Design a protein around this ligand. Structure first.
Ligand SMILES: CC1(C)CN(C(N)=O)c2ccccc2N1Cc1ccccc1
Ligand SMILES: CC1(C)CN(C(N)=O)c2ccccc2N1Cc1ccccc1
Ligand SMILES: [Zn+2]
Ligand SMILES: [Zn+2]
Ligand SMILES: [Zn+2]
Lengths: 572, 562, 388
C-alpha cells in the first residue's frame, strides 16, 4: 500500500454544492456526447468513465465492438465481392444492397451521422467552454489534482522506487516505448533526398518542400520514389527492430487529389516489402483543399472526400478490386489531419455551410469540416468492416498545437486520441474533460519549443502530474534532434528539464502503448496478459516497471473525481 | 562586414573614471598574477591579454609562442642524464647528480616561493570582496550581454547566410571534443557489477591491491570500445580522466603498462590524470604517513621517467598521450583550514584532516611546473593543470585556479563572483561545463550560467561529466549539445563556436588541430578562423575579438592615465 | 551630452532591404490610414510621425490592416525592431544611468512629488465605498483630496475641480471625449450585441471630443486594429504584446496607453507578465492609472501606490517614474494653458527642446534618447520607401 491523501470534510470538492452541480451536470452531458460519437465510430471510450456514466445513463452503453504478410498477393484467397453499392450523399458514404443498375438497390441501414445533431452537440460544448462559473470549478479541480500528485510523491516516492529496485530486470532501457506521433516523410535526410532528387532528374534526362513531395506521389509511378522511401523506412524498421523495446507509429500521406493514391501506396508497401512488427501506419489527410481548388485540380470538396474514402469502401466490399489495399489496411489503424493549425479560420462549420458537393469556392473548409466528414465516412467504413471481420479504424488528429481552442471541442467528440494539445492549458473546461475521459495526448515538446511553445512553457509536466494520458513522441526525428535515437533524446530533455522520476518515465512509456494501434496479442506480451484490466490489476511491474502504487493513485484519483461529478448529478 | 555597436563620448565605461581607474589597476594586477604563474608553469596565457599587459609593464613578459604502444625498446629511448631528485618543502628539486660527485648542486629550476603565492592570493582574495570593483565588473558583464543581443539582432542573418555559403560544413562535419569526461564513468554498472562473477572505493583498490590483469583487460575493452565509437564518428573526440590516487608509487607504472599491454590508444582520446583529494581517508587507514608521501607517489615516477626514460619504460610512452592533471572531490565538502604560511607543510601534514583545495592545487602546480621545465629541456611533452573548479563550495576556489590553472571544469560559481567572471573573460580561461550533470545534482538546468558565459564571450565548451549516466542516448556529447541548443534556444554560430572552443581548449597536437581548424588557428581573431572548417562565420569571431580588445583597452587606458 | 549607441554597417535594421521595404510599405500605409481618420474625427495625430509621413505624400482599410497584422514575414521585421528598441534602452541605461540620476539631482527643486501626474483611467462609480453605499458627496472629497494634492490630478469617467476632468463612458451592451467600457473577454461571433468593431465605427467620427476607449484588455486582438484607426488614447493595452505589428505602429504613432498594472493582476493578467515595463523601455507612450481606486489599492494615495508597486516590482529608476508622470500629463485632456504651467510654455516642442527638468524632473538625456530613437526608426521606415 501507500500513503493515501484523504480529503475528509463537507465541501470535499471545495465549492458549494450549488456550484458543483452546475459544472457536474454539464460535464456529464459533455462526457455523454463523446461516448455517443465514439460508439458511432466503433472507437474507444474510457471504461472507468463509462462504468460511472452507466449510473446516470438512460440508455445502455458498453464495449460491444511467420511469412512476410504482403508476400502472398492472391486475390483468390481474399473475401469475395458482396455486390454492394457505394455512393456518397451529403458528404457521408452510403452503402447499398446492389452494385449495378441491373438489380434493385436498397440502402444498408448503417448509423449514418446527422449533421444537425452534430451542430447541436458542438454548440452545447462551445457554450460550456465559456461559462465562468464552470471554468472556475474545472480550474480548481485541475489544481487539486496536481497538489494531490505532489503529496503522493512526497509521501510515497521512495515506496515507488523500492518496488522498482525489486524486479531489477526491468528498466526504462528495456520497457516497451512507442513513438506515438512521427511523420514518415520526415525520416528522410534532406541532404540525401536532394541527392536522390538531383540524380532522378538526370535519370528522366537519360529544402525540398513537402509540396514537391506530394506531387511526386500523385504525378509519378513512384518506381524511383518508392525505392528511396522504401529503403529509408525499412532501415528505420530494422533500427527500431534491433531496439526490441522501441516502436513507431509512422504517418503516411493520402492527399485526396486522385483516387489511385490509396492503390499507389499499397503497391509501395507490397512491392518493396515495407512491414515491421513495430511500425504501425496512420494516414494523414493534409488539409490543402484551398491549394487544390485554386489550381483547378478538384472541383468539389466531395471529390477529395471521395478519392480518400471510396477506395477504402470498395476494398471492404470486393477485396480483389484493390488486392494490395486489402492487405495494406490490416496494418493501417486510422486517419490523421495535418496542416498549419496557426492559420486563421473565417468560416464556422454550421448547418448554414456549403456541403462537400456545394463547396466549390477556393476557400478552405474549417477544421471541424475536415474532421466531421472524416469521422462520418470512417464510422460507416468501420461499421461495414466490422461485419466482415476487418480492421476497425480510428481518428487521431493534430489538435491543439496552435490556432483556436475550439479545435479541441471537435476532437473531444470525434477523436480517440489527439496530438500536441498545447492549448488545453488555456481551457480549464476542456482539460478537465480530457482527464475525466482519459483521452490520449501524444506530445512532442521538442518540436514545440522551436516553433510554438518554449520547453519551459510546455504543459506536458502538468498534464502528466494531473493524470492526463500523456506520451512522448518525436514529431520530426531528424530536424529537432541531434542524436541517432530521437525517441530516447525526447525522453531525456523532458526527464532532465522537468526532473522526472523513473516511475514518471515508465508511466509515459506505458501510456505510449495504451494509446497505440497495436494488437491485443502484442500488447499482452508487451504489458502482460491483463493489460486490458483497468487499475492496479492491469499492471505488472515485471513488464512495465511502473509500481502498482502509482497505478493505484491514478486509478483512485480518477474514480474519486468521476464519483464527485456523478454523485452530484444524483443528489439534485 | 557586420553592424558594429560603438559607444560615443568620454564615460564609455558607464561609471566615474575613479571607479574605472580603481577597478582597472586591480584587474591589471590580477592579470599579471596569472601571467606570472602561467609562464613559470610553461602553461598558456591569452596572447591578446598579454599584448595589452606588455604596454603597462616595465619588463618584457615571459609568455611567448605505427601504433605508439606497439614496441617498447629502452635502448632506443632517450638517455639517462643521472640527475638526482629530492622533494624539499613539497616541491621536487633536481640535483646535478645522485651518486657521489664533485658537487650535487641544485639545478637552477625556477622553484616556487610560497610567501609570494600567499601574498598574491591575499591580494586577489581582497579584490573579489571590494564592492566598488564588484559593481564596476557587474556593469561591464551586463554590457557584454547587451552588446551580444545587438549583434544577433543586427547580424544573425548575415552570420546564417555565411554558414550557408559553405554547405560542406555543418555541426556534424565539424570536429568536437568532449573536454571533461571521466573514463571510469564509461563502464556499465550492471556489466561491471556482474563482472565480479561472484563504489569508487572498490575500483580504487582493484587498481592498487592487485595486478589489474582481469581488471585492466576488462576496463581496457570498455574504453577501447569508446575509442572505436569515436573513430567511426570521426568528428567526436574526448579527453578522458584516469585516476592516480597517490597511495603507492607503482600506480603510474601500473597505468602505463595497462595502456601499453591492452593498447588503449586512439587518435581521438587524449589522457588527463585526476588525483582524487582523499588524503584524510588514506591517513585514517594508515596507508600514507605524511601528505608529502602522496605528492611523492604522484610526481617522483614522472620525474624519474623524465630523467631516466628506461627506468619507467611504458611511462615514457604513456606520457606522450597524457596532457595534464586534474583534481576531483565533492567540492561541496566544507573547508576548515586556510592555506597560509602558518599551515603545515606536506612532510608535516600527519593529521587526519584533508588539506584545503589550494593546498592540493599549489603543490600539484609547483611540482608540475618544475617537471615541465625539465621535460621541455629534454624535448618531452609538457603538462597542464585543469582542475575541477566552481561546481560548488566557496567562491575562493576560483581564485586558486585563476592563478594556477590553464582550464577549469564546471565553473558554476562565477555567476556569484562578478570580478572573477570579468577576469576569466579578459584572461580567456577555458570553462568545460556539463549542464546536464549540474541539473541532477547542484544547479537547475535553466539557472546554469552557460548562456551568460557564452553570450559575454568566455571560452565555454560543452562536455559530458558522466557519459553513461545522465544521458539516455549513446552519443552523449551530442545529447549534451541538444538540450543546451534547445533549452536556451541557440543558433549554429553558438553551437559551432562551442565546438571550436572545445578544440581550442583541448590538449590535442598542433598538427591535428591544424588539420581540424586550419593551418593558422594559432592566429588571434578572425584571421585564425576558416569557415570551411569551423562553420563559424568571421562575423562572430570579429565581434568576439573586437569586444575583448576594446574591453582590454578600457582597462589598459585607465591605468596608463596615471 | 550623453553616451550614444551608434550602429554602423549595412543591415542596420537587421534584415535585407527587400524585407525592410516589404514591411515599410505596409507600415507607411497604415500610418497614413490613421492620420486621415484622426484628421476627420478631430482627434490628435503624432507630430513627429506626421512630419516624416508628409515627405512621402473604412472596411477596406480595415481589411488592409487586418492583413498586415497577420503578414508573418512583416511580423518578423516588427519583432526584430521592437527587440532592438528594448536592447538599445538597456545599453542606454547602463552607460547613462549614472549621469541621468546626477542630472535629476542637479535640480533638487523637482522630485517625484513636485512633478505633475494625471490618473488617466479611473471610474467614478468605483470612488464610492460599497459598504457606505449600503453621489456628489464621494466625488466632492475625491476632488477635494485631489485639490489638497497640489501636484496630483486625475480624469474621471461618468457613465468644477481644476484637477478633475470628465470623459463619459458608454457600455457596449469640461468633458473631453468618450470611452467604450465592457468586459472585453466576451467572445465575438459576428463580424462587422453589436460587436466591438461596431460601436467604435459610429463613435469614431461623430465629433472637440476625442475617443479614448477601453481597448486591449483581453478578447480579440483586432480591437487594437480598430483603436489604431478610431482612437487617440487607449486603456489597458495588454494585447499589443501579442501583436508585434500593432505595437510597432503604436510606438511609431506615439499612441497613448493608459495601463492599470495593479488591477490587471486581479483578473486579466499577472504583475510579472504585465507588458508595461517592456513598453516603457521601447519608448511607447505609457501612463499609470488606477482602474478602481479602492478595490485593488490598500492605501490612501492609490496612484502613488500604483506607481510604487510598478517601481519596486520592475526596479524602475527616478527617470522611469518621472518619465511616466510627464506621459500622463501630455496625453491628458487638458489645455495648452494648463500645460503651459504644469509642464511649461515649451511643452509643445517635441524632443529635448520641450523638456524642462525644473518642471518634469526628467533629464534631457532620456528625452534625447527617446526622440532620437523614434526619429531614426521612422527614417528607416520612410527613407526606405523614398528611394524605392
Ligand atoms: C510523399 C512521399 C514523400 C511519402 N509518401 C506518402 N505516401 O506519404 C510516399 C509513398 C510511396 C512513394 C512515394 C512517397 N512520397 C513521394 C516521394 C518519396 C521519395 C522521394 C521523392 C518523393
Ligand atoms: C579504477 C579503474 C576502474 C580505472 N582505472 C584508473 N586508473 O582509473 C584502471 C586502470 C587500469 C586497470 C584498472 C583500473 N580500474 C579498476 C577496475 C577496472 C575494471 C574493473 C574493476 C576495477
Ligand atoms: Zn506532427
Ligand atoms: Zn567531473
Ligand atoms: Zn476600466
Amino acid at each position: 500500500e501507500f500513503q493515501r491523501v484523504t480529503i475528509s470534510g463537507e465541501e470535499k470538492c471545495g465549492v458549494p454544492f450549488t456550484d458543483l452541480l452546475d459544472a457536474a451536470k454539464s460535464v456529464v452531458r459533455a462526457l455523454f456526447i463523446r461516448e455517443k460519437y465514439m460508439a458511432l465510430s466503433l472507437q474507444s471510450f474510457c471504461p472507468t468513465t463509462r462504468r460511472y456514466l452507466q449510473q446516470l445513463a438512460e440508455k445502455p452503453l458498453e464495449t460491444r465492438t511467420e511469412q512476410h504478410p504482403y508476400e502472398h498477393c492472391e486475390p483468390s484467397t481474399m473475401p469475395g465481392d458482396l455486390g454492394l453499392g457505394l455512393r456518397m450523399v451529403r458528404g457521408v458514404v452510403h452503402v447499398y444492397t446492389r452494385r449495378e443498375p441491373d438489380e434493385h438497390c436498397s440502402e444498408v441501414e448503417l448509423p449514418y451521422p446527422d449533421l444537425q445533431e452534430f451542430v447541436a452537440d458542438v454548440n452545447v460544448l462551445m457554450a460550456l467552454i465559456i461559462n465562468g462559473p464552470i471554468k472556475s470549478f474545472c480550474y480548481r479541480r485541475l489544481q487539486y489534482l496536481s497538489s494531490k500528485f505532489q503529496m503522493h510523491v512526497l509521501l510515497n516516492e521512495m515506496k515507488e522506487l523500492a518496488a522498482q529496485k525489486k524486479v531489477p530486470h526491468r528498466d526504462f532501457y528495456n520497457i516497451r516505448k512507442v513513438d506515438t506521433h512521427i511523420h514518415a516523410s520526415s525520416c528522410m535526410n534532406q541532404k540525401h533526398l536532394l541527392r536522390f532528387i538531383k540524380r532522378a532528374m538526370k535519370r528522366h534526362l537519360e529544402p525540398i518542400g513537402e509540396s514537391v513531395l506530394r506531387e511526386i506521389f500523385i504525378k509519378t509511378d513512384n518506381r524511383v520514389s518508392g525505392k528511396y522511401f522504401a529503403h529509408i523506412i525499412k532501415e528505420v524498421m530494422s533500427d527500431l527492430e534491433e531496439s526490441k523495446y522501441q516502436n513507431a507509429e509512422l504517418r503516411l500521406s493520402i492527399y485526396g487529389r486522385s483516387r489511385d493514391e490509396w492503390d499507389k501506396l499499397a503497391r509501395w508497401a507490397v512491392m518493396h516489402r515495407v512491414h515491421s512488427p513495430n511500425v504501425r501506419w496512420l494516414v494523414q489527410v493534409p488539409r490543402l483543399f484551398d491549394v487544390y481548388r485554386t489550381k483547378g485540380q478538384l472541383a468539389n470538396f466531395q471529390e477529395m472526400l471521395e478519392n480518400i474514402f471510396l477506395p477504402l469502401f470498395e476494398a471492404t466490399v470486393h477485396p480483389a478490386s484493390h488486392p494490395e489495399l486489402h492487405l495494406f489496411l490490416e496494418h493501417v489503424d486510422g486517419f490523421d489531419s495535418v496542416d498549419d493549425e496557426s492559420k486563421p479560420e473565417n468560416h464556422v462549420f454550421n448547418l448554414e455551410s456549403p456541403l462537400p458537393e456545394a463547396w466549390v469556392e477556393e476557400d478552405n473548409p474549417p477544421y471541424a469540416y475536415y474532421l466531421y466528414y472524416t469521422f462520418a465516412n470512417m464510422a460507416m467504413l468501420n461499421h461495414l468492416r466490422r461485419q466482415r471481420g476487418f480492421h476497425t479504424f480510428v481518428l487521431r488528429p493534430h489538435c491543439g498545437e496552435a490556432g483556436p481552442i475550439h479545435h479541441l471541442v471537435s476532437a473531444f467528440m470525434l477523436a480517440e486520441n489527439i496530438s500536441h494539445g498545447l492549448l488545453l492549458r488555456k481551457a480549464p473546461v476542456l482539460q478537465y474533460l480530457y482527464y475525466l475521459a482519459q483521452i490520449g495526448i501524444a506530445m512532442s515538446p521538442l518540436s514545440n519549443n522551436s516553433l510554438f511553445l518554449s520547453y519551459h512553457r510546455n504543459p506536458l509536466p502538468e498534464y502528466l502530474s494531473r493524470g492526463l494520458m500523456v506520451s512522448l513522441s518525436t514529431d520530426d526525428p531528424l530536424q529537432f534532434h541531434f542524436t541517432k535515437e530521437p525517441l530516447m533524446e525526447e525522453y531525456s530533455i523532458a526527464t532532465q528539464v522537468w526532473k522526472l522520476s523513473s516511475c514518471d518515465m515508465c508511466e509515459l512509456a506505458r501510456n505510449s502503448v495504451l494509446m497505440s494501434g497495436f494488437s491485443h496479442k502484442v500488447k499482452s506480451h508487451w504489458l502482460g496478459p491483463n493489460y486490458t484490466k483497468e487499475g492496479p490489476e492491469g499492471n505488472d511491474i515485471r513488464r512495465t516497471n511502473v509500481p502498482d502504487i502509482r497505478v493505484g493513485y491514478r486509478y483512485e484519483t480518477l474514480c474519486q473525481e468521476l464519483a464527485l461529478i456523478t454523485q452530484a448529478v444524483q443528489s439534485e
